[PDB]
Design a protein around this ligand. Structure first.
Ligand code: 357
Ligand code: MN
Lengths: 552, 427
């Protein structure tokens, strides 16, 4: 039955008014079916007859589809929703399972007719009006309006869930031990009691509810631990995502590939190791959700390694606020980083990965940081506090980088983990020029049009070189120019560019890049013993750049 | 209080709709704080709980203002503001005295606690709504909406403006020379007295306020000099500078003049008359970098001349009150940070540098956040309006920690950059 639950006052957007979408008279038996149901709902108060003294309308539909044991009513409300005020977004963020506390016993009450039980603001009922048709062309006019929360109107979940909370509160207070979590139609009641008395509370909670016209599972329960919720396998002491099947074929379209990837990430939560820098690597450069893509080699390899992992079942443990959050990160390889948050040795609260940034030049230390970050953020949202990191980097290799980094940072507390791969300084540029070391005045330039370029240098020692280049841009040459000097320079060198770009890039001390070249200009940086890079202005900036500006 | 006053009808901008902003996640610690704070306000009737018919939302943070044992609620009305105050920058605009910046000392004291007495226009409350978060988003946020003029809200000072120039009037009556500026929650009292004389004049005001309008500023130190105390004194007459100086030296090298012709050439963008072509001609050769060389003649007439064009500030540099202030900061090193407040490229209206400690408490973040609040205040004083900071920090990071050392009641408007490169030698 309906409740003595005071209603939430609703309004229609400004200026706007009630919807008048007239009914398309239609099908005798179904044109009775509604009347068969309407007069049944109307009995229970869910609805009420109305003269056409006032209102508008909405499309009433009769629809049967199941194993056909009864037909069901339906009312498209869209032209109404389109006119109703906004409410407080219900499910902002779903709680992540990795941060829930174990409960000895947990039951799920299936609040059923929910909506039709909560009432509806008296002055906003006039709009829910609809009309079931005549036998055929002679409108007799079976007119009713809703007194409860109509089946698909905007302000419904909100006002429903809003009303539930209010109803629970006395109980939730007369029993500060029963944690109730209402999600949509469900009610998950957890606690730490003897299964006997835990059954009591449920029945009590259950009887409470019923006194406000709300009803619940009379099979006294309807709990199927683990619970299938939002894509999780929720046990009372662990969690996962069972149906995690990544099918195979010999045809992979932007569609299926995405879908595979998606499914793969989702697993990252608890499945230690999953990778995706390969199956996605493909995507950019297209927007054809039906275009066949060649499952590249790494893609085939990675997809396997994900199967190996996934082939064997892994679980997730819950949160104990009694202990410390530890989170630790390890590097995988292709700008890939994984991690897991534990409070215990062989247990895991969650696991995850971190993919690099811009399709260009980054750095192992920087990344490790963006990771500690990604996690610090995540952690705050789930457990409300930051975790104690453990990481593959020594106070030295780290502190050195930020001290030199033009950008501010703040890594919470951490402890060293001597488990490789390790994050380190693969090289450093000298801060002051190198006395003795030959000086290479490098430079370059290419034709934006012809795409033909030159890369060369001229040393103080009077040494020169100019090398031709095809399929190249002003930038790629200026780098080639450096790569060149480094190549011909001795174990110690001073390079001099007019390109702010090439400078900056190298300066960032990138460990890796997606530009075959930079990886080269690094490979050598690393080899070299002492290197000094210096910047001078382009043309008016014709310092030692007098010779290298056009001979090159 | 308990005295219903005529509410000043508030209406957002034209065809504007209230704010709907994401309430960032918080530590459990701070949630407990906020919950505590609000549960009390709800009792003093300041705020109430709302229903789902209230779709609006403005963010909230918990911070400690005077590091004092307990917290303070800090509501980020940066959004409800643009949606209103900009016609409450008009409707009830609060005028900015161009001399306060000239005073010898400007003590800054809070007054936000005054507002909590003026009830808010019933049909506006629906906009001051905020949400206290749930950890892991378990429960539904707690939902509250304001009933008195909210603090972070640049519309309370505008409404109260009246009740204030009154209380303050029989004080400016006597001490006339002292200028008083009100910017939102704070009061900026400026004088020219001798430190101690001033500091006394302030306390003289503190109690005026306190006693007359029950308003309640606060006492800097609590009658105790632990050698770790302050009172928020600004000395505006002290600021203006030229941290931009070519290094004067005896012997120069190729790499020394090089890096010099570099900056010097760059400087050209900001400073009008600056030619370097003869000093640079001294570089046209492919000479080693360590090789020392002395300064030419027409060249030596440049370092000498330009060193001097670096003492006479730009010209067309005027304050366009139509445009807003932009503040760029750059990590300098060992707790040092330089900064510019321009309005259009290279037309800085002010450059200074923060640096408070490098080795002990020095935290890349805690520095910047403080640097930000400093740079702000200066402008709130100089121009009576906060700038838009271009912070050299990663968004997520800053979003996580600013609230840790943010002690001010207002919150500027920031955005995160890529990498100041050569603009770092603005040191
Ligand atoms: C995952 C199972 C569970 C545990 C381990 N602990 C709880 O406290 C709880 N609820 C009683 C309260 C949840 O409060 C936020 C649930 C039920 C549930 C069912 C589906 C989804 C979730 C997040 C929890
Ligand atoms: Mn060039």
């Amino acid at each position: 039955p309906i409740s003595p639950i005071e209603t939430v006052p609703v309004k229609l957007k400004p200026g706007m008014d009630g919807p008048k979408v007239k009914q398309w008279p239609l099908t005798e038996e179904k044109i009775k079916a509604l009347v068969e149901i309407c007069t049944e709902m109307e009995k229970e108060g869910k609805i009420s007859k109305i003269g056409p003294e006032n209102p508008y309308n909405t499309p009433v539909f009769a629809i049967k589809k199941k194993d056909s044991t009864k037909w069901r009513k339906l009312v498209d409300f869209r032209e109404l929703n389109k006119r109703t005020q906004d409410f407080w977004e219900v499910q902002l963020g779903i709680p992540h399972p990795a941060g829930l506390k174990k409960k000895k016993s947990v039951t799920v009450l299936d609040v059923g007719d929910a909506y039709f039980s909560v009432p509806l603001d008296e002055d906003f009922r006039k709009y829910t009006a609809f009309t079931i048709p005549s036998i055929n062309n002679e409108t007799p006019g079976i007119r009713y309006q809703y007194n409860v929360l109509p089946q698909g109107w905007k302000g419904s979940p909100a006002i429903f869930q809003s009303s539930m909370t209010k109803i629970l509160e006395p109980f939730k207070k007369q029993n500060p031990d029963i944690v109730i979590y209402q999600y949509m139609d469900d009610l998950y009641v957890g606690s730490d009691l003897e299964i006997g008395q835990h059954r009591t509370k449920i029945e009590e909670l259950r009887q409470h509810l019923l006194r406000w016209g709300l009803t619940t599972p009379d099979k006294k329960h309807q709990k199927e631990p683990p619970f299938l919720w939002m894509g999780y396998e929720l046990h009372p002491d662990k969690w996962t995502v069972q149906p995690i099947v990544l099918p195979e074929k010999d045809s992979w379209t932007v569609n299926d590939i995405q879908k595979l990837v998606g499914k793969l990430n989702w697993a990252s939560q608890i499945y230690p190791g999953i990778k995706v820098r390969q199956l996605s690597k493909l995507l950019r450069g297209t927007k054809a959700l039906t275009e066949v893509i060649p499952l590249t080699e790494e893609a085939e390899l990675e997809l396997a390694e994900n199967r190996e992992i996934l082939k064997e079942p892994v679980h997730g443990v819950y949160y104990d606020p009694s202990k410390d959050l530890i989170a630790e990160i390890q590097k995988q390889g292709q700008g890939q980083w994984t991690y897991q948050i534990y409070q215990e040795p062989f247990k895991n609260l969650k696991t995850g990965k971190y993919a690099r940034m811009r399709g260009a030049h980054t750095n192992d230390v920087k990344q490790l940081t963006e990771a500690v970050q990604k996690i610090t953020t995540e952690s705050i949202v789930i457990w409300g506090k930051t975790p104690k990191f453990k990481l593959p980097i020594q106070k030295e290799t780290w502190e050195t980088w930020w001290t030199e980094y033009w950008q501010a940072t703040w890594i919470p507390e951490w402890e060293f983990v001597n488990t490789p791969p390790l994050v380190k300084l693969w090289y450093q540029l000298e801060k002051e020029p190198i006395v003795g070391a030959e000086t290479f005045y490098v430079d370059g330039a290419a034709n934006r049009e012809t795409k033909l370029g030159k890369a060369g240098y001229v040393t103080n020692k009077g040494r020169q070189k100019v090398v031709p280049l095809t399929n190249t841009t002003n930038q790629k040459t200026e780098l080639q120019a450096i790569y060149l000097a480094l190549q011909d320079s001795g174990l110690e060198v001073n390079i001099v560019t007019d390109s702010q770009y090439a400078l900056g890039i190298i300066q960032a001390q990138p460990d890796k890049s997606e530009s075959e070249l930079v990886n080269q200009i690094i490979e050598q940086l690393i080899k070299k013993e002492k290197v000094y890079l210096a910047w001078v202005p382009a043309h008016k900036g014709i310092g030692g750049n007098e010779q290298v500006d056009k001979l090159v | 209080p308990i005295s219903p006053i005529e509410t000043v009808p508030v209406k957002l901008k034209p065809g504007m709709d209230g704010p709907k902003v994401k309430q960032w996640p918080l530590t459990e610690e701070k949630i407990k704080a906020l919950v505590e704070i609000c549960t009390e306000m709800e009792k003093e009737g300041k705020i109430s709980k709302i229903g789902p018919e209230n779709p609006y939302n403005t963010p909230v943070f918990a911070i400690k203002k005077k590091d004092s044992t307990k917290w303070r609620k800090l509501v980020d009305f940066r959004e409800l503001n643009k949606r209103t105050q900009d016609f409450w920058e008009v409707q009830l605009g609060i005028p900015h005295p161009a001399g306060l910046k000239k005073k010898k000392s400007v003590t800054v004291l809070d007054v936000g606690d005054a507002y909590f007495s003026v009830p808010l226009d019933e049909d506006f409350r629906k906009y001051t709504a905020f949400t206290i978060p749930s950890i892991n988003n378990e429960t539904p946020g707690i939902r509250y909406q304001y009933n008195v003029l909210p603090q972070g809200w640049k519309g309370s000072p505008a409404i109260f403006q009246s009740s204030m120039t009154k209380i303050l009037e029989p004080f400016k009556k006597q001490n006339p020379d002292i200028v008083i500026y009100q910017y939102m929650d704070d009061l900026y009292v400026g004088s020219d007295l001798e430190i101690g004389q001033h500091r006394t004049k302030i306390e003289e005001l503190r109690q005026h306020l306190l006693r007359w309008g029950l308003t309640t500023p606060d006492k800097k130190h609590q009658k105790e000099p632990p050698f770790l105390w302050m009172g928020y004194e600004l000395h505006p007459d002290k600021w203006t500078v030229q941290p931009i100086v070519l290094p004067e030296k005896d012997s120069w090298t190729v790499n020394d003049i090089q890096k010099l012709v570099g900056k010097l050439n760059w400087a050209s963008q900001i400073y009008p008359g600056i030619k370097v072509r003869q000093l640079s001609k001294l570089l046209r050769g492919t000479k080693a970098l360590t090789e020392v060389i002395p300064l030419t003649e027409e060249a030596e007439l440049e370092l000498a001349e330009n060193r001097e064009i670096l003492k006479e500030p730009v010209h067309g540099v005027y304050y366009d009150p139509s445009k807003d202030l932009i503040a760029e900061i750059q990590k300098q090193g060992q707790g040092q940070w330089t900064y510019q407040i321009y309005q259009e490229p290279f037309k800085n209206l002010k450059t200074g540098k923060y640096a408070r400690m490098r080795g002990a408490h020095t935290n890349d973040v805690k520095q910047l956040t403080e640097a930000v609040q400093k740079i702000t205040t200066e402008s709130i004083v100089i121009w009576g309006k906060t700038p838009k900071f271009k912070l050299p920090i990663q968004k997520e990071t800053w979003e996580t920690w600013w609230t840790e050392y943010w002690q001010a009641t207002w919150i500027p408007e920031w955005e995160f950059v890529n990498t100041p490169p050569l603009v770092k030698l603005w040191y």
